[PDB]
Structure formats: C-alpha cells, structure tokens
Amino acid sequence: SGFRKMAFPSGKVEGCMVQVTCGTTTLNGLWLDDVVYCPRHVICTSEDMLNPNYEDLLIRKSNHNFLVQAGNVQLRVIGHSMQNCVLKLKVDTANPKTPKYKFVRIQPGQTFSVLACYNGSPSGVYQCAMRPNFTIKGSFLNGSCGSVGFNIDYDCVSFCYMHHMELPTGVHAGTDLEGNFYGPFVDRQTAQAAGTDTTITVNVLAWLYAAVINGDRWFLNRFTTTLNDFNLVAMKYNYEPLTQDHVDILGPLSAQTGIAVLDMCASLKELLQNGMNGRTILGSALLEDEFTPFDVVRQCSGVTFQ
Amino acid sequence: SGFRKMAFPSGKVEGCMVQVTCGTTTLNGLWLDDVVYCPRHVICTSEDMLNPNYEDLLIRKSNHNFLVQAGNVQLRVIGHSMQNCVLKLKVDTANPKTPKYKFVRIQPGQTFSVLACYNGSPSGVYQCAMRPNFTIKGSFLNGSCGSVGFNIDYDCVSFCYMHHMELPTGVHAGTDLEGNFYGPFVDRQTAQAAGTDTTITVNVLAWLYAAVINGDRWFLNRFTTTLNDFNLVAMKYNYEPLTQDHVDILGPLSAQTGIAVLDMCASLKELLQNGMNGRTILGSALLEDEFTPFDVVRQCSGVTFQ
C-alpha cells in the first residue's frame, strides 16, 4: 500500500537523449531511428529570439552547422527539415537503443513523466499533468529545451511533450513530437499569457478513490448529489465541470471500492464547503488533481503485472 | 524555474534489476558484477514467514534452487551466501550494464529515489526520505521486495535501501545493501511498530529557501529568533530540534538568497503559530520535509552542469 507521485522508469528515454548545437545555441534532442528531433529555436542566436524568421534561418544552414553528440560520440547530420516548431535532423546512424514508440498528442487533464535534460544528459524525472490552460507546472532551467514528456504502455514509449519555453507566471509550454504547440503559444520571446487555470475534477475524484483503496476513509459521508448540484458547488471553487464521460471513466474505481461516483461527488462537495479541519488525505492538505483514473489503477494494482 | 518532487533518472538501476525465484517465493534482485543481491526471505515459503530460521533454510538450498532471470535469459547461480538480511548469489556472468556504484548507509532526513519493481521489471520511480523513525512512506505491493533506493552522484549510483516489508501503519522498512535494517526491525511477520515520526526541520527550511529562489516570498517577515526560542515553538508542532550542524548546512542557501538562517526560522515560527490562511507555498498547503538542502541546490542550479 502507499500512494506517491510516481513517474515511469526513464531508462528507455535516457537512451534517446543527445545534445544538439547550432551556433551560440545548445539544447537537447531526441534520437529515434536515424532522426534527431529538437526545438527549431536551436537555429537562433540569443540576440534573435524575440521575433525570429525560422524559414530564412533554416535555408541559411547546412548539415555541418549541427554538432550532434551522443555522449562523447559525434553523429553526422546528412539532412535537415522543419515540421511546425521541431527540427528533424537526419543522421547516418540509427540509434541502437531506439525503444518501441509512438508520438501522441494528449488531452488536458492527462499526466506524463518528464525527463529533464541538460547538455544532452538526463538530470531528473518528475510527474506532471497537461493543465486545462495547456501549460504544465514543470521544473525547467536554461539548457532544458528538448527535454520530453512520455507515458510507457507495455514496452511502448508514447512521447507527448517536448519542452520549449517558460511563461512569466513560472509555468511551461511546449509541443507534441510533430512540433505543434499545446495551447495558443508560439516559440518567440513575446508577452504571451495562459488562460486562468482550473482544477481537474475527474483527477481529484480518482485521487479520493486512491485514498479509499489505501484505507483513508474519514471524508466519506452518507449523502448523494446530482451531477448538476455537484457542478453548482465545484464550479464555485474553480473546478472544471464534471461531464458524464468523466463519471463513466471513474466506473472501474467505483466498482473496485463500492462507492458510487455521485456518492464520492457528495464527499468532495462537503470537503470543498467545509474544508479538511486540519486533517489530511494521503498526506496532503490540498485536493490533488495530477493523478488520472488510469494512474490510480496502475499504481494500486497494474504494476504487479510488469 | 519551478520546483517538483524530482527523482534521479532510473536507467542505470533498471539495467541491474533481475527476478529471483526460490520455491513458492519470487521477488527482485540487484545484479552488480557477477553477484545478485536480494532479500533473504526469497528462501521462505509463505507458510513459514512468521518466525523463519534463515540459517537452516539456507544450508538446505543449492545453487540450482535459484532461478535468476535477466528478462528472458536465465543466469546460472554458482554460489550462495547470506550477509545479515540479504542473500548474495554468485552467477557465472558479470552484468555488462553494471554502473559505477557504492553501497552507502544513509542518515534519517536524507532523501533517495526508489525504483519500484515487480517480476524483476521496473514499474515506477518516486522520491522519498528516510524518516526520523527509520521507516519510509513508500508505494509498495506484494512482489516489490528487492526494489532499491539510490542517489546518483556524477555517473556514480549510491545504493542506500532495499525493500523488505510493510508495517501495519502502511509505512515501509528495509535494509542497506549489506543487509542491515534501518531501524529496530527484523524480517519476520511479527507485530513490530515504528517510533512516533517527527517533521524533518532542516528539510522544511531548505524547502522555504527553494520557495524564495522560485519567487514565493509572502511568508518572509521582519523578525529574527534564537535557535532555542525557535526549538521551543518547533518542538510543540512535532518538529525535530534544529541543531547548529543543520544551521551550518543551510549556509549555502542562506548566502544564495540573502536570508539569514535564524530569520528563515522566524518566518517558519510564524507559519507554525498562525498557519497559511488558505495560502500555499510552491503549490503546497503543508510545509514539505522531503527535500534536503542538497536537493534544493541540485534542482535549482546543479542539474544545468549534467
């Protein structure tokens, strides 16, 4: 038993991380097969990141204007193209450690592991969620771009995020592995703001089910609620409205625990209105929203089948 | 910027994980060089884990009573010995992926990454701390024994924990890699209890420095305190007494931020007496104690030198 912010094992992604340098710009690349993927802003100088012309910048470059190092061993670039906001660099050697993989574009509320990298080298792993405003609450410094987010399913790595920038609020923005931004953001040093964020209601409910699985039951009450009366309360506390589809995906946890989804909604309603009274739930004084229903089943049972 | 519960990249440890089976007991082993390390209770049957005689159980076994699988490929055992609560299994093949490593025994308050494993296969990574009562607040199920805790320094893996059991309070106990229990625990299914736990004061202070580094400053006040007047308050809230040695190891964060350690103690005193008033610090309503001073410097700067 126990319930932690759990990330996927990072080794399969570590074997893909390389360094990419173009001019006075160095960052991280993802080496899969004979392609290295990386943020297109590697082709900028610092003096030219406010409103760059990537199209011009790219034609002006040749394959020898890209040092790719896999640790110590240079990889010769033999081709270069841009898709949306990523650079694809064709190299002369397929990565022997390329895992089984997919490029996926995730939905807001979905979680993933981030391998934070510097100088093409893995530094740390943590878990986070695509926020409803298409930002992530990451931990990233200068040099971290090209770090990726991923889920693992079987021996299959689903890459979902590549890091590009920090907004002034201290939150992070990036792309899918086809180079398409999550949210209404562009890769330039302009005054962009995220939407006001919201609490991921279905994840809060999933995490109250994890608390019950782990013997933490004090907040369960004898009441029920309708979906609309729940949303009337929840939206007052800046929770996303709960949808029938979200009730549906909670069904397996409801069946496992014997607590009806709208009964768990009743418990959450009372927690929002009354607060916790100095109590905690799985060691938290806040209601956590960065575990999906799948995350709860994986950590509480699925891992034993690894 | 940003501050997450960050684990070390797990790939170097993933390359060491194998499965060990002896009879009706399967768990995880750590394969370094030509030795596999694992909990000695692999030599029990379930019916015989209440008060086993490991000495007897061990002599009754031969090298062919141990199936070691590195994924699909069996490793022939050519010798077997017991040190404290670990089994060492000599095999005929040194692990080609053995990292540079040390066995270290950590202190209470120190943090480490856990690679949780089932069937000799990596399932998840999370960060935790050796609690003052020599337990850890883990996430472990049936099949997880032999999962390890570690820190990485350079390319060097310091192994500090091997998982053996869960106490009735839902917390975890285990050994160093020489098989010595952290705390007053034994590897048998008897009614053992941990000491009442305490809050790791120096880690709370480290995490208030991380909050200041990351622009979260609301809780800083104009006051100072003496060490004894601080401990008078802190011990009332179940905090470990702050020692001069703990003040000393906060010095680098004090110099970086320009906030004197005893001024930060004054801010923590006011937080303990008044509470947060619905405010949060780095997204928490509780004062977090599972980041060391080193953890804060690593995540806020050190990683850029990876």
Ligand SMILES: *[C@@H](CS(C)(=O)=O)[C@H](CCC(N)=O)NC(=O)[C@H](CC(C)C)NC(=O)[C@@H](NC(=O)[C@H](CC)NC(=O)CCOCCOCCOCCOCCNC(=O)CCCC[C@H]1[SH]=C[C@@H]2NC(=O)N[C@@H]21)C(C)(C)C
């Ligand atoms: C990874 C990179 S690496 C290489 O280090 O590995 C890092 C990861 C960072 C992290 N901590 O997570 N990423 C980066 O460093 C980013 C790279 C960028 C290429 C995306 N950068 C950042 O993350 C930086 N973040 C930002 O800069 C953010 C969001 C991008 N923004 C801000 O912080 C707020 C800044 O606002 C300042 C105001 O900016 C301008 C306002 O925008 C509107 C104007 O836009 C149109 C521009 N117009 C022109 O240029 C016209 C020119 C010609 C006509 C002119 S000339 C005379 C006329 N008069 C006029 O008025 N106009 C006419 C960072 C580093 C975190 C801060």
Ligand SMILES: *[C@@H](CS(C)(=O)=O)[C@H](CCC(N)=O)NC(=O)[C@H](CC(C)C)NC(=O)[C@@H](NC(=O)[C@H](CC)NC(=O)CCOCCOCCOCCOCCNC(=O)CCCC[C@H]1[SH]=C[C@@H]2NC(=O)N[C@@H]21)C(C)(C)C
């Ligand atoms: C990893 C293993 S694996 C194989 O699955 O990979 C797992 C990880 C578990 C996890 N979730 O983290 N680990 C385990 O399964 C552990 C393996 C063990 C070998 C350590 N087990 C556990 O973690 C279990 N945990 C526990 O069992 C814990 C702590 C060990 N304890 C409890 O939960 C509380 C249980 O208390 C029950 C009472 O027990 C007995 C009281 O103890 C005092 C007595 O001790 C002396 C015994 N005396 C004798 O035997 C005397 C016999 C002869 C004389 C007798 S006969 C007639 C006379 N009359 C008398 O009165 N006496 C005389 C677990 C699985 C989590 C619950």
Ligand SMILES: [Cl-]
């Ligand atoms: Cl939701």
Ligand SMILES: [Cl-]
């Ligand atoms: Cl302390």
Ligand SMILES: [Cl-]
């Ligand atoms: Cl909290």
Ligand code: NA
């Ligand atoms: Na919803």
Ligand code: NA
């Ligand atoms: Na102390």
